[PDB]
Amino acid sequence: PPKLTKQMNAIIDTVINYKDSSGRQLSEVFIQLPSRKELPEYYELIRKPVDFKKIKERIRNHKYRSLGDLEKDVMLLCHNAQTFNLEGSQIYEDSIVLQSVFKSARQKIAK
Numbered sequence: 001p002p003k004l005t006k007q008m009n010a011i012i013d014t015v016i017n018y019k020d021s022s023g024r025q026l027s028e029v030f031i032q033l034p035s036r037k038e039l040p041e042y043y044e045l046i047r048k049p050v051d052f053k054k055i056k057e058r059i060r061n062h063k064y065r066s067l068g069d070l071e072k073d074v075m076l077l078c079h080n081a082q083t084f085n086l087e088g089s090q091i092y093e094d095s096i097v098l099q100s101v102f103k104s105a106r107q108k109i110a111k
């Protein structure tokens with residue numbers, strides 16, 4: 001794979017694998033969106049749905065021109081989680097932590 005592809009895969013794999021001090025993998029709920037037929041209410045509220053599987057697809061298929069474009073999709077995923085899920089819920093808080101994990105992984109891997 002090209003250098004940018006390896007860097008993006010390392011960044012997103014770091015985010016997906018991140019665990020809190022209890023050993024819980026925070027990305028678990030964000031890997032795969034519920035289907036439109038099972039939870040249409042999600043798609044009525046969230047204009048541009050995205051999950052980590054879709055971000056991995058966009059890295060795999062060379063859709064992100066820059067790390068800024070990848071960051072935009074990660075921040076969109078976290079924005080969608082905060083929009084749909086209750087403030088203070090574990091999912092909402094986890095999405096805030098993952099925004100920080102992404103920024104840290106990006107700085108470490110891309111230098």
Ligand SMILES: O=c1nc2n(c3cccc(Cl)c13)-c1cc(C3CCNCC3)ccc1C21CCCCC1
Pocket residue numbers: 029030031032033034035039042050051052077078080081082084085091
């Ligand atoms: O914003 C999200 N809220 C949610 N999800 C998400 C999945 C991927 C990305 C995002 Cl950004 C989300 C999400 C994902 C699931 C999966 C669907 C596939 N089978 C395993 C479970 C179930 C439920 C959800 C919520 C959280 C709980 C309330 C319903 C919606």
Ligand SMILES: [Zn+2]
Pocket residue numbers: 060061062
């Ligand atoms: Zn390729």
